[PDB]
Amino acid sequence: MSMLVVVTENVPPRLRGRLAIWLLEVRAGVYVGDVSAKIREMIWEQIAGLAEEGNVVMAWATNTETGFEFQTFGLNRRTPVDLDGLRLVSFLPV
Amino acid sequence: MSMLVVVTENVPPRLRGRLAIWLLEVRAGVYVGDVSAKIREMIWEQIAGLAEEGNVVMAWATNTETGFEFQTFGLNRRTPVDLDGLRLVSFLPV
Amino acid sequence: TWLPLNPIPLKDRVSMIFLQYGQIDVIDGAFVLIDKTGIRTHIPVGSVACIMLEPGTRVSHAAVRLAAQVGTLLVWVGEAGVRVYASGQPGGARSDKLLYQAKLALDEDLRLKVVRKMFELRFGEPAPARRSVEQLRGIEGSRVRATYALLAKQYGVTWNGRRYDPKKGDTINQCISAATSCLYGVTEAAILAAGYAPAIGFVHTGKPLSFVYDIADIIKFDTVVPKAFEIARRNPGEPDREVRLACRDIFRSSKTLAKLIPLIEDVLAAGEIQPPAPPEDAQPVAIPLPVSLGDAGHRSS
Amino acid sequence: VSMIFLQYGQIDVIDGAFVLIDKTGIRTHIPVGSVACIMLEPGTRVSHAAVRLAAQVGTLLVWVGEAGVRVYASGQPGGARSDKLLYQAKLALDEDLRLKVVRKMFELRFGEPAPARRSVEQLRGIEGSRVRATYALLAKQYGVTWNGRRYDPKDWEKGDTINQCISAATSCLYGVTEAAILAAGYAPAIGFVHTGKPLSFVYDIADIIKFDTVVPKAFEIARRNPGEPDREVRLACRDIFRSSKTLAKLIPLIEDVLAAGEIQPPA
Amino acid sequence: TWLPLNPIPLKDRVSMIFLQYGQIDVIDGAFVLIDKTGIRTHIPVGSVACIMLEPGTRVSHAAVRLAAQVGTLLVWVGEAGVRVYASGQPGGARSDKLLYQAKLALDEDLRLKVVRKMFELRFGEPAPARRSVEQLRGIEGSRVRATYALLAKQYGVTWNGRRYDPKGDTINQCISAATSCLYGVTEAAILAAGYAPAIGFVHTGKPLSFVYDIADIIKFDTVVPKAFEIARRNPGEPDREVRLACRDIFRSSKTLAKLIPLIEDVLAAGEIQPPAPPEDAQPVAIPLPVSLGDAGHRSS
Amino acid sequence: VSMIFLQYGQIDVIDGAFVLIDKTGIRTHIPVGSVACIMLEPGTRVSHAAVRLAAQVGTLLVWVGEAGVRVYASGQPGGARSDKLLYQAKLALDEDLRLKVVRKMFELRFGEPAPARRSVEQLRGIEGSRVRATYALLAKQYGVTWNGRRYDPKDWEKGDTINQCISAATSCLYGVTEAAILAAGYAPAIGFVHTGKPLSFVYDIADIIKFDTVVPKAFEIARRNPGEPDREVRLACRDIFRSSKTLAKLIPLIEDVLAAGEIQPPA
DNA sequence: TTTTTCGTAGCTGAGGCCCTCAGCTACGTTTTCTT
DNA sequence: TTTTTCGTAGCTGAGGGCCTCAGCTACGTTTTCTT
Ligand SMILES: [Mg+2]
Ligand SMILES: [Mg+2]
């Protein structure tokens, strides 16, 4: 089991509550919890299935280089970028 | 070293960049990283010193019951609440 | 537009939360506690094995439904923290499990093997040769009084026996009652999650929580009662909260939620018999059971 | 045996009695002694005191859909009576007792005795035939285009209208039948014909009475061809359950079915 | 209104990041890489021990200042990945450390003790009794050729010696890039511990002498085997994959965590204590602020 | 030690030469052979090619504030020359060499020779006396109310205007002095009078020339009593550094100080 | 006796918080070390 | 020879994205198990 963070934007109330089933919402659209791998994947399929027009990013603790990994769904001005294996965030121009 | 999440709101650009020194910003005001205890305390005094009119919540992975702990600075409609030692979030009415 | 909601494994959950002072509703499909002033408090219901409803709570239909769908046991408790009522999915999801338990319980010799295993797990050694179940119960009575005396002397608490009033006793009895209540909560949760009936027991019988009593009695003095004595000596004004915190800590440290289903499975396994296969004359399952991320006893999709 | 359905209001305790309360004041007085079972329909809210009283007198609370067309949660989960569950289980575990129960189910289903002692698989065949015949008969009586029973357990919308109706009707029926089984104090998972499902016994009992009422109405509504078929079938089934005391007469049937084991019932 | 910015320990950091194709600026006090189209990419500079600037980058004054203040080493590399230049805080923050190193380096017998320790740590056993530094360096030459041959046959890569033109074959290109990464983090570590990269014991009289010493201690334990692995994989563009491989080998063998203790141990073999301030000296008028970072980096 | 200060533009390479580029085109041609050291002032941006060239010819890049009133970063960190650092260190490590150096420093402070051979701590006493005396002298020459040297290393805003001015001036001076020390190729941390501070040697050298220019200017500005004293002092110090070649004349002084060890310099 | 009453989801428009940026001005600075 | 040119922080008003809610309507439902 490892720490999980889900950040949603412009997402239906359905998904907001659905995430609130397992995770603690500390700010609007920002959910925190602690889950196993398999549960994390199920939550991800929930997000992919219910996000609709919205966009979501999910980050979780690992024993990798940076201590965590993250993946996204939908379009956002801030999008992940690869630098020789290190994943950072690119901020696109308007 | 453990996973760290900082969520800022209505905070000066000074603090935004300052956090960007150590943490990865995946959404506006949402920073993720992996730090030791002492560094986390330092980041916290940076937040307490630079947040001004804004409000911030910081959550980090632990070996406690829920797998993580969190603390806040400034006023927010969503505020921590204690239930026999379990810390949840109360959402205050307008 | 819609995706099913399912339970997650019990081992992956927080043991329990106590709710008091408010109405419990559903908002946007989430479990929520609302007080008189309008303050909302979301409760990650799926992430909890057991939800304790104290006096002054009022639960909506939708909330009970939701709690059942994610396989979270709702437990209504009175003051001094005793279990009063419970709500959850109507029953076990697997026929073979329930028939396994019942077959074990109905046959005296199998029953005896199961009880003997319970005894071995509880005390740390084989029960004496050729004993009936009631004689084992006698041995257990003796050892239990010895254990109460021992804890009473280790923590230095005056002990005049187990005594309670139905609406009281000394601090230590109140503490024991509340702690035991928490244990029965998570144990009933575990028994239901594993897919068995709480009513069908081996040592205790003919009671609505017989199996709960059996399984809980196996680990009670390993877990909740010492902590009850610790708190008793601390002499607090209102024991129940301190007992809740202490029980959560002891459950977490000794990995109770992780070991409860294997404990049950092992206990039953001591019968040396396999869960009965479906009769060959039976009608084949027309629609296959959906694969589940949760425990075997909870319903899915 | 007695039970009451409560709807739209809060269940509280006044003077040691169960009370249903709305804005207009006390809506329904329920003396504690008069009900073994309380069915909570949607729009209900249970006070702690009500639950406390229910525990004190050993009353079963069951959270249900309307008219019991859905069962969602139950108090006393897993069943509150050892003797009932063990009665059912003993019946299911013993080859010949089970055989008697199955034979009774098939006879009630065919209406008067099943053949001397044809085997069980053969009875399943004969009734498969009977069921197809019944589908055809209802199809001609209600005059509905019928190309057989066909449905996709993963996509609700690819069968024809009549198959949707049939499925929704049987769904509701499974609801009230589960309600009745819980009221009787038995486990829905332990069946005699059906096995290996959370509701095997529910299917066993439901298949007995399936064709008397709700499947014909599935056909009726199918011919009416409304905008929202499944919903009209659900509502119609609700009405049928309310008017014809379905849940009330389901319990004697269950008890009879089990009684066919020629083993003695509890209290 | 303002709070000081300080370095964090090297062990707590990611080893290195390679930046290319863009201008590096400061926005709201943060290190940022901007490309031709306006795409911003924030780089957690404080969380990184070493930043590699590839061709086509242009670094602002503010950015260099910022990188120094958080004690992150900037390293300009050419392609084939070779280190070219470096930038960081002007020097060690502790007098006694530098005087310790210099005293060790200046005295032959002390120097010899240090070199002998280096040899023991590198090869896994004591150097033979009664040897000068040049004779130890001879022994090291022999063993090094032996190691190249051994790796060449274990990974099955054709080996015709260490060769490059200021071009070489794949294994040599890989070795050059990997070694470059190692020199990066090692220089970072040496500066963080508070020592001078120019003052070495085995290699001397070169701007990175001490870097060569320390790096040579762990080089064949770490970066060169990985160079051979990649060499046998035979990629189009060796350098990126060498980078990934080096990052992985650094994290797995906890290199950043062990580099400063390794240095301290190496020097400690001199059996001497870092010199105390002279009693005639003027006392420190304003006390050093306590730091969360390493001893060699400046604070507040 | 030839050097150039570059400001407001990008440093690139054209035809193997260092070039400073604006919107207006090439602003400054720098032949590679003519500079040992390039000081980058605020508003500069360094191209990769420039750095590569600087490495090829071994040119020191130093990121500085204006006129060198602040030092922020240095290429070749820790120093690029072994022999320089070892010269300095050997001087610092040996008791008698160190003593020769300290005595030379004090003689430069006093004008010409400190007393023949009475101890160092005692010389520090004399220098304290003389420093306070100088504060008083400047205070009377420029007519500034003087209640002694007072400042709070943690709160800048507590001392009087003149103390702020003095502190800011000495700050700038520490800037250019560090610049000069880096240009000479020595370590700022290794001092002879001051020790145990990252800039001990800087303090050593700076205290020699402190009172000739910038402290008097601190007093002048103090009496002018402007809105922003510290800022006016910084700008004034910048101007003084540019007009009077302070950094250029600092290096011979340093080399002289060290030369007093009567040990021979490198190349 | 003619008692529509409760809890929750979907939808939409109003209000408001706050992120993002263009455009303008001011700046090269967060210091002190023989108090 | 009269060459003000570059990079970055603070400020403010405009634009806009999205969270939050009041107020209204519709609803009790996410099913099938002898195909
Ligand atoms: Mg007992
Ligand atoms: Mg070598």
3-state secondary structure of E230: helix
Q: Provide the token pair at E92.
A: 């060690």
Report CA torsion sign: F195, F197, F202, F208: negative
Those nucleotides of strand G lying less than 7 Å from any protein Cβ are 5-10, 17-22, 27-35
Environment class of residue E158 by beta-carbon count within 10 Å: exposed (0-12), middle (13-18) or buried (19+)? exposed
* Whether B14 and E29 lie within 8 Å, measured CB to CB: yes
Q: Smallest CA–CA separation between B51 and chain A, in Å?
A: 16
Q: Pick out the nucleotide with least CA–C1' distance to D66.
A: H28
Cα(C166)–Cα(C184) distance, integer angstroms: 18
- What residue has token string 């963070």? A5
18-37 in chain A: CB under 8 A from chain C: 18, 20-25, 33, 35-36
* Whether F89 and E95 lie within 8 Å, measured CB to CB: no
* Dihedral in degrees, nearest 10, Cα atoms A63, A64, A66, A70: -90
Cα(D21)–Cα(C51) distance, integer angstroms: 26
In chain C the domains, ranked by start, together with CATH numbers, are 1-95 (3.100.10.20), 96-301 (1.20.120.920)
Closest-approaching ligand to the CA atom of E143? 2
Cα(D123)–Cα(D83) distance, integer angstroms: 31
Q: For D52, which of C84, C88, C276 is closest by C-beta distance? A: C84
B86 within 8 A of B65, measured Cβ to Cβ: yes
3-state secondary structure of F241: helix
Of F210, F19, F54, residue with least CA distance to F130? F210
Q: Pick out the nucleotide with least CA–C1' distance to F238.
A: G28
Q: For A26, which of B32, B34, B59 is closest by C-beta distance? A: B59
Tell me how far the alpha carbon of residue E215 lies from the centroid of ligand 2, in angstroms.
9
The CA R_g of chain A, rounded to the nearest whole Å, is: 13
Tell me how far the alpha carbon of residue C213 lies from the centroid of ligand 1, in angstroms.
6
- What residue has token string 């329990």? C16
What is the DSSP annotation of C222-268?
TTHHHHHHHHHHH--SSHHHHHHHHHHHHHHHTTHHHHHHHHHHHHH
* Whether E275 and F93 lie within 8 Å, measured CB to CB: yes
Tell me how far the alpha carbon of residue E141 lies from the centroid of ligand 2, in angstroms.
7
Gaps in chain C after residue (C–N beyond 2.5 Å) = 167
Q: Pick out the nucleotide with least CA–C1' distance to B13.
A: H9
What is the DSSP annotation of C140-187?
HHHHHHHHHHHHHHHTT--------------HHHHHHHHHHHHHHHHH
- What is the CA D141 to C1' H7 distance in angstroms? 88
Check residue D24 and report its DSSP letter: T
Cα(D45)–Cα(F171) distance, integer angstroms: 74
φ, ψ for residue D17, nearest 5 deg:
-120, 150
The CA R_g of chain E, rounded to the nearest whole Å, is: 20
Please give the protein residue whose CA is closest to the C1' of the nucleotide G21: A94
Tell me how far the alpha carbon of residue C140 lies from the centroid of ligand 1, in angstroms.
8
Cα(E204)–Cα(E210) distance, integer angstroms: 8
Are there at least 3 beta-carbon pairs closer than 8 Å between B and E? yes
Work out how many CB contacts closer than 8 A connect A with C.
Answer: 55
Distances (CA, A) of D239 to A48, D28, D148, E219, F208: 39, 21, 27, 83, 105
C209 within 8 A of C197, measured Cβ to Cβ: no
Q: For F78, which of E56, E58, E191 is closest by C-beta distance? A: E191
**The residue type at C55:** P
D200 within 8 A of D29, measured Cβ to Cβ: no
- What is the CA E39 to C1' G15 distance in angstroms? 34
Q: Pick out the nucleotide with least CA–C1' distance to B14.
A: H9
B33 within 8 A of B18, measured Cβ to Cβ: no
Tell me how far the alpha carbon of residue E208 lies from the centroid of ligand 1, in angstroms.
76
Please give the protein residue whose CA is closest to the C1' of the nucleotide H7: F43
Those nucleotides of strand H lying less than 7 Å from any protein Cβ are 5-10, 17-22, 27-35
- What is the CA C69 to C1' H30 distance in angstroms? 13
Cα(F188)–Cα(F210) distance, integer angstroms: 17
Q: Pick out the nucleotide with least CA–C1' distance to F129.
A: G34
Of C299, C280, C277, C279, residue with least CA distance to C289? C299
Q: Smallest CA–CA separation between C152 and chain A, in Å?
A: 38
β-strands A2-9, A78-83 pairing: unpaired
* Whether C41 and B84 lie within 8 Å, measured CB to CB: no
Distances (CA, A) of A55 to A12, A29, A58, A88, E71: 10, 11, 10, 18, 37
Taking phi first (over 0 means left), then psi (-120 to 50 degrees means alpha), and beta for anything else, what does residue E60 get?
Answer: beta
Q: Is A1 on the interface with C (CB under 8 A)?
A: yes
**CA terminus-to-terminus distance, chain C:** 15
φ, ψ for residue D184, nearest 5 deg:
-75, -20
D11 within 8 A of D20, measured Cβ to Cβ: yes
In units of Å, what resolution does this entry have? 2.7
Check residue F43 and report its DSSP letter: T
* Whether B24 and E46 lie within 8 Å, measured CB to CB: no
Cα(E295)–Cα(E193) distance, integer angstroms: 6
Cα(D206)–Cα(A5) distance, integer angstroms: 46
Environment class of residue C91 by beta-carbon count within 10 Å: exposed (0-12), middle (13-18) or buried (19+)? buried
- What residue has token string 């959950």? C13
List the single residue in A with minimal CA-CA distance to E252.
Answer: A65
* Whether B25 and A89 lie within 8 Å, measured CB to CB: yes
H or E stretch at B42 = helix B37-50
B5 within 8 A of B22, measured Cβ to Cβ: no
Q: At what angle do helices F95-110 and F120-141 cross, to 10 degrees?
A: 20
Alpha helix (H) residue ranges in D185-228: 200-209, 214-224
* Whether B34 and A66 lie within 8 Å, measured CB to CB: yes
Cα(C221)–Cα(F257) distance, integer angstroms: 81
Cα(E167)–Cα(D184) distance, integer angstroms: 87
**The residue type at F114:** A
Neighbouring chains of C at 3+ CB pairs within 8 Å? A, B, D
Q: At what angle do helices E255-268 and E108-123 cross, to 10 degrees?
A: 140
